[PDB]
């Protein structure tokens, strides 16, 4: 590419892997969003919350695709794997699944940053720091908060817990 | 499900297949969108055009997921297959690929409508007619228009054709 | 902590030390602020200037406390030592004391950044770069400017110097 | 000091002690504020509530420093001791700790007022009455209200109590 | 300098070299801008485009001069060399020359960043990342886009190519 | 050139020399501007004043480049020489240097006008009269005013002089 400069083939490949992972995380969140609008779950603010999470991950996936083009890399898409479950069991189980998902996404981003550093690619390092790493920390912290409150309130077995959390925290 | 009524298991399964197909079509269009923002393609209104196509297909996929929940069906997600190509070759090739994609999506919707009719599900039939069938006809017609003009202008080999089409029709 | 990831115990401890140092710097500046509103000093814009410096350091201390929580560390507070003097002697002496204070704070931040780099913590490195390191450089530069002008004007012994600097530069 | 009049050295010293105590109370409240934004506590309106308490105590400390200067006294700062705990255990425990803290601060203010009266310093007595004594009574009453409601709701062991109090009373 | 801290003499010297290079790039772009307003070239949006490029490089040069002062370095100016050509031959030749110029400027910035990293100067590294490295990537990508479209349209020999590109892309 | 009329080759060459001289004067003023934002000079309105002088000279250089194109001449750029000093010593020394610079620029413009008159080029003569000669007289007069006041105030050795001039005249 006539724009390519200081852009290692390993970084290009790692960006393509991260694109797939952010698309996958978007899909997991979409699955969770529509679990909570089932007639036998019906927690509409959990639904809205995870739909917003899904949009955020889609935006980050697209920004990585833009980055690939900006640097002269070439996007290579792969299948987006279906999520591990269609039935997410409870508000608490979904929040815990989201927390684990984001820590896995965070680990991948940190490994991508370490690669960028190894290859002396400060543009890529800054891109990750500016748009990904602190956003990931904020989301993980928020999910941790939500898990804590749900557990303390007695979710999933206490009948009022997820209902009240849906209407107060996620409202 | 305590909401389920007149909703055949075959229709539920066929809705799950259509959800996957609309997500797949969304992915194809996303792939096309970022092909046109490559530095060696750089047709930004083709890029915008296919990104909009992608959003429309995502909306239709989500509306089918909502429908499944509304009727008491259960969403079952599957892998979203990667598109057939990462390199879409030209503006004309992409428009022709999109036209073929939409005719395939349209055929699936029409088969879904025929199933709904066979199972005496007028709610499902109306849902498809109201939100899917005429939108598909409009999009196919528009893609046909675009293919015709691109071919007549001399795309892909004529150097001004896709450039001028990008700036005039898709601008 | 269920949110903790890639966060080294040394970094957590170093953050707790920096919190104490930023609180201490806030206290020094508060002391300076109220020195200049003594009836036998009465330089109200020096007073306002150092009060603003104090608020800025309090904000940075709180942002480090927020960071500790965001990353799953645990805040451990220590005594905030009283400043070295209650009588800051003159506008020039206070500005020189502030310059030395900020260089000490800056050195601590740079050592914290070097630790973050050693521990492969790019989130922490970026946090320091984004919110602390350039703000410190700007403040040190401004204090250098003020010291230069005060010295050139003949502070502290020239009777008009601090009075005129208070009303023109700090007004 | 050429402004000093009817201002007893004991009152000056007692004002310096009260400044340290109000700064200490500010620090305790800051500690409490950031306890409630831990991922394993996550009661953000408790956090906001105690942060506001902290700002109020900082304002009262500064107003005492202003008073010292207004009367021709000389501010003598001392170390601000760290709070007794970093882990405040629960919303109820923190509210009870705050109530005890404010009664101790109130006792010190009342002793300061008695000193002012003994030394025939009505300006100092009025300053305390106008800006400190009724504000202290209001805050103690409010903390008493909060403690009562938390206890009645079943805090800290009842899972919904602090969550609901956070969102309704402190929201 | 009484403000100088953690600022290596090599970094100071390298900043002075980068200032000259950004001023030089500004001069090249100014030369290109007025080539396109010749009566025998007369592509006024090419002219505007390169004038804007020139202003951007002047701003970056001045920001490096500000940085030198902020850190306590001392600006040392050198001759600004005249550009390689006064006659830039065509819109396509100028865009290709600009692309090569920016890659050379980018290489210098990346080497400056590597120096900052070697000398443990995170303030300088962040300054380059925040204000220079991503701006350079964006400009190189845009120039790549423009070169691609011009080539595909048949520039410089096809009579309509640069005229149409001037009025559509650069308008 | 098909636009060229009554435009002598000597005038074209002399215009190219004046372009270089106005660019050089712009560079001198830029150097002066950033001398006054050194931490050990820190006269920010001197800095602003000379930056404005620099922009004015850049505008006049560009207007001469436009003139060359308007008349069918061909711009030939040369190196822009670095200024005589990086350290401008004082506000007074810089103002005196600027006065000498502008008289040299003025002499060149007057010689250019005499050439235009010799070659019977009234368009060029009017261009110089309308945009250059009275602007030069105004700037020289202003610099003379500033030099006079600085000298009378006791610059550079009197500590208040440049400080007060910076804040009152140049503010
Ligand atoms: Au993601
Ligand atoms: Au997001
Ligand atoms: Au679709
Ligand atoms: Au659509
Ligand atoms: Au601080
Ligand atoms: Au600040
Ligand atoms: Au207090
Ligand atoms: Au208060
Ligand atoms: Au530049
Ligand atoms: Au720029
Ligand atoms: Au000039
Ligand atoms: Au001017």
Numbering used by the authors:
A (entry chain A), B (entry chain A), C (entry chain A), D (entry chain A), E (entry chain A), F (entry chain A): 6 to 176
Wording from the paper:
It is a nearly spherical 24-subunits-protein with exterior diameter about 12 nm and a hollow cavity of 8 nm. Like human H-chain ferritin, the ferroxidase centers of HuFtMt are composed of A and B iron binding sites of conserved amino acid ligands His65, Glu27, Glu107, Glu61 and Glu62. Herein, we take the compartmentalization concept to re-design the intrasubunit interface of ferritin to create a new compartment for fabrication of fluorescent Au NCs, while keeping the inherent protein cavity functional.
Therefore, to create specific Au ions binding site at the ferroxidase center, we re-designed these centers by genetically introducing cysteine residues as potential coordination ligands into them under help of the YASARA software in two steps. Among these three mutants, the as-prepared 3Cys-ΔC-stabilized Au NCs emit the strongest red fluorescence at 650 nm. To characterize the core size, the as-synthesized Au NCs were analyzed by high resolution transmission electron microscopy (HRTEM). According to Fig. 3b, the 3Cys-ΔC-stabilized Au NCs had spherical shape and were homogeneous in size, which was defined in the range of NCs (< 2 nm).
